[PDB]
Amino acid sequence: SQLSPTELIEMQNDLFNKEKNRQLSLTPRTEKIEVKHVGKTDPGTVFVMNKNISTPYSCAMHLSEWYCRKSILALVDGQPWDMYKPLTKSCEIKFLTFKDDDPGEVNKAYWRSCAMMMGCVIERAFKDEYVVSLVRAPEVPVIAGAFCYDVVLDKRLDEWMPTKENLHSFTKDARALIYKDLPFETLEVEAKVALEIFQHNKYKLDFIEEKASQNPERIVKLHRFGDFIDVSEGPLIPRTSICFQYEVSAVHNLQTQSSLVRRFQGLSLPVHLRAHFTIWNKLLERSRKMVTEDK
Amino acid sequence: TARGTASRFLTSVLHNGLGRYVQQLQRLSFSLSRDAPSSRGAREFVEREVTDFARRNPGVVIYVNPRPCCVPRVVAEYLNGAVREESIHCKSVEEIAALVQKLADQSGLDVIRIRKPFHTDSPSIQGQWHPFTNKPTTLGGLRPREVQ
Amino acid sequence: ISRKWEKKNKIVYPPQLPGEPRRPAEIYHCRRQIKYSKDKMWYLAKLIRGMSIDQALAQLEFSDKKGAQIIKEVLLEAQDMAVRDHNVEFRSNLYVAESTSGRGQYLKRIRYHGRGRFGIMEKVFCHYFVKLVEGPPPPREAPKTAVAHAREYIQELRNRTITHAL
Amino acid sequence: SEKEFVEHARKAGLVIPHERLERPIHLACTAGIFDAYVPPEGDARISSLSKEGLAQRAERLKKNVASQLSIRKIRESDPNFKIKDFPEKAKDIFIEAHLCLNNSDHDRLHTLVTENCFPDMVWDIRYKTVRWSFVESLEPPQVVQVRCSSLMNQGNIYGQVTVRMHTRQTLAIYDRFGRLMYGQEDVPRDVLEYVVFEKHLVDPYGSWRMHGKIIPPWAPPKQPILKTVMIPGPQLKPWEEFEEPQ
Amino acid sequence: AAPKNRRSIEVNRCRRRNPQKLIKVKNNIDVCPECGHLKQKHILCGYCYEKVRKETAEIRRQMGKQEGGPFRAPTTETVVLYSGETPSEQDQGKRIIERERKRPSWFTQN
Amino acid sequence: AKKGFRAAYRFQKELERWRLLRCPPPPVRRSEKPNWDYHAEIQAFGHRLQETFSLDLLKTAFVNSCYIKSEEAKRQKLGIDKEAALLNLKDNQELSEQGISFSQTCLTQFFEDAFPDLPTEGVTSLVDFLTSEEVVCHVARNLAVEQLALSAEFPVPPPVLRQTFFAVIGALLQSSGPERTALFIRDFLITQMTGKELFEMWTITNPMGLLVEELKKRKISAPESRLTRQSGSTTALPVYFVGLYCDRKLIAEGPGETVLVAEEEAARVALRKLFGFTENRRPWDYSKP
């Protein structure tokens, strides 16, 4: 359809806002939930929180600012949980940082956040006349030296590959995006509304369908920061500015029997685990390679 | 001391005097006493010269208030909203009339130092001096040591 | 003496009409008759001025001055008051707006020098006043940049007028 | 140089000056409630029927011999004492007390409520703005029981009257900064309590003053607070370990 | 030497408010991941060190109560054990301290 | 204990002054102030402008619908029957409409007979500026119309102030003659244009475009922008002079920081020269024909 990219962004934001208002109006009253703190530092702590309003970020604010600074992920008694997602019922919370003994979940969440950021930068750094479709965020483990993102470009862009100047421009765009603090908001929607939210990316529609297939209730996790909306697995980091060092290593063009997809690879390190110059150079040189992991 | 006090430019309220003159004195309220020896001048003025002044100046509301007060005062409220308070304590009728005429002829502005004794809007008739208003032009606008 | 920084905590504001922005809560507190010195307490006050309560307590925990523990106790008591008495949730959502140190009533003693000479030794005492405002800490003022300097200089050049001309 | 400080604030009460008082402490009311009325847990459904509540209330008020003898003693101590004209006066006193607490009229509040009701209703509200109103009353106030405490060491009789009151009120408690804290001002929420008024019968004036406010144990919980509350963990010493309760 | 004139408050402030005399902010502050208190990055945690000091004081008090003499020092290795523990074969032949308190979490068996 | 009363009373006056400086009270109504007489104020307002109004017309113009509504609310809150006289206040809406219409028509005619080259949008912008909220409010506040306007909200917001001013204008129109009202308008509204510029109140967007349109209307081919003189090209504050030549004839010249701003200024000067609103124009004739 004849729709400008800014018009698409506005429509997506408006539809997400309507769904958010519906989710908020689903509960007319403010119920009291009794949340325990099963953490290691302050045991026995009890919080009288609001249902579908209070957040683990508000719990950290109740505790102390050190928690708001350190704790990235939340474990609600059985599962990970982002900071900006409202609580549902009474439960117990345990905070999770980067330097913990088992930080695997937080590392994967940071990986997904960086992948979504790189995807947004790639989607919004290209020209209007060219068509660009994000496929998904390939879940690669932490051992892989970079986070990858799959992008299908126009048919006329299948000849050239981004040079060092283009990679540096992408890195500058990512740094400028990080400079302005953007909160990651997570919402639980249905495929029936996700299809009309996207309505343009056939790959995104197929991804939503295959993610809702394994979901008995057809529940899809949407993530949105600033003006960009994307679907991804697992929770995300609360703030964007947590990503201190960020680089776009290179891109790898993989060809299939259906179409060819650019696999953009990026490297990132937060402010809590920033490294030295030589260490960063070695890690970037390692990320320069090819990363292949789908199942 | 100019640096100690404030300063303002010579301005007129609502561009008075251009189209028609408007007496800037809106109201004049005397507060005096009937038995105090200090209010003798104010009493004699209210007896003698308030009617002639009221007839001469119709655009000013003149209020008179005899009340149990010790110091005779006069409050002039102008069109700009300014309130000027003066003391007529033990002053002869001539001095009272002089002060009344002064308050009538005043404009109500603040009595501070005036920087410029003149104020002309657009004084740039026939042109204003600029560093190029008296230098001749060369052929083609060439710089002194520029070759074409 | 004078006691107004404590009475400032008992004022009542009219109810906020529906539609007006939420006014942040303000809590005044003070510690009277501290054995510390006026200037030495003012140093810590200036150190913890404008910072968040969390970072202020973190700095006071490691500060080697004797007044560090004093100001830490004062801040803890002020936070407890803001939580219990005042309707201020999120006990870590406070920032120090003002933190000052003044003098109080001294004591005079005789300090001997020698050769029959003496001095009036002054036992010092200082009051410490603190104000906590609910909300995020205000950002630090950045140094003026070259672009702002150039704009202000162009403005000052343009605001000139021909003096003593008319 | 010999100069020291003064005005050291200390609070220490001693039995010798407490007993060496020239005049005994004159109390305008009793300490607390002697006989607490225990209501049945079926009132929540009985109030749904109009006559099936009035009949039971009248029967319970008539068959209790203690209430009957207390009413008879109040009558013989002071004439012009009627049970039928009491609920309206009690409702008016309650409404006036609420309006006085709204308007912050402490003298009138002292005249209305007693010395045991004033602090519990003024302490945590002296620094807050309240907007209370009266819209409707579902069930009329019903006098349940009447008790009397007669202290013979001084010959003082104090009569208390318990009245079940089912009211429809609107409460909006603001804070000292002006922001809303407790609830909305336009919600006419229903409440059901028991007001226990107290009056000294030996006193020649004898103004009916509210003394106690009884709530049933099966009453629904109050409305949730608009803010979030954090309960701190147990403050443990370094040489102490934590014990998780199960 | 004597001062010639009284220094004005402007110069007084310019002297005693210079950043050289202002207390600098220390940015090496961190939290102890064990107990949640505050500590520096190059200094042990105060709370944990106080716990260890209390436990060491108790252990030394008991091992000194075992030795009724001031100059009666153990000639062999020493081992501390808590309630619910028995000396193994590697712990036999050494001096033994017995504590009624249970073995804390930080104290390793080893 | 220093015996005396003069020092004590003077210090009480000082304390009152300090309290006034500390907590400034909101502005109170001049009518609510002690010394006030409404009929005397109306007569003084009529006599100070050298005009002959009608007392009933002024009392009709100085009332407001907001004041009527406030008085009706007070009546309903008090419980007194006031429908006999309060409903007969004759709100000044019609007088305000007549004043607005006549003032706009007279200002348009004045501008047309003064500057024949002013376009329709130009004269409309001039009339709207002279009848805008700021100018009318300033004139009324200097004429003390705010103090005599019976209305709630003593600040007297700009809409109410302008409505009351134009109601006074309509009352003058109905009492005295149209020529006298036109002279009143000329003396109390056009004086606000002394020293002001045309574009400061016109606020055009494309001066060069408007100029080439005016040249197309006046049968002129096209202006050429040429650099006449310049003072520094690589300095931090360049100064350029751009002139407009039509058929190799200079019509206007403008200085500027950059060449584009200088050409914009030259276009503005050319537009002012074509429309006749120049700093060397004839001063407005303030006389009695």
Add this chain to the structure above:
Amino acid sequence: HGKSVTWWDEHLSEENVPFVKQLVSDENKAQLASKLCPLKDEPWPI
């Protein structure tokens, strides 16, 4: 954001510190070995 100070040993592990030391050491050795023959790669005109 009161960011703290960070050195190269704070976030590393016992198994990574020797690896990092070796990775920089052999890198410097290889660089000095590659720069050992300058006259054969591209010398300037003498």
Add this chain to the structure above:
Amino acid sequence: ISHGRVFRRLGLGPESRIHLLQNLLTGLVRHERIEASWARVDELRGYAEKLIDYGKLGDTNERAMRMADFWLTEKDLIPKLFQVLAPRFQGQNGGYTRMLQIPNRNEQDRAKMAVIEYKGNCLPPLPLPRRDSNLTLLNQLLQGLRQDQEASS
């Protein structure tokens, strides 16, 4: 000028410094973990290392015997020194002591205090500052780099 010096001035002079270090070393040998001023502990570290080296030298060595007689004031420590600390330190070369700076003393002096401890003692372990786990982000990336380097050879 204080260039090329290894000993720091303590006490009332050289002999007073020697006596203070002797008392500190006696307390350390007796209690197996002590705490003192940071400079005193840093100075005592080397003397404790040398004392352990002398104790490991054997019982019949009269040089080490008289050295321990001079240093250990309480003579009930010399048999302990030769039959507990020296035998348990045989394979270890120089890793006998552990020094850690504790928070400043709560007294008004606010001195820089440290704690020294002989390894292998019968005391609760100090809260040693440990490295981060290998599951961290940077450590995992370095493990990946190491695996790539090993696969390249």
Add this chain to the structure above:
RNA sequence: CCAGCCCUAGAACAGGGCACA
């Protein structure tokens, strides 16, 4: 980039080192 540990560098503040061992 400067937490901490050394210095033939230094009152404090500054400066040079902490990968080959």
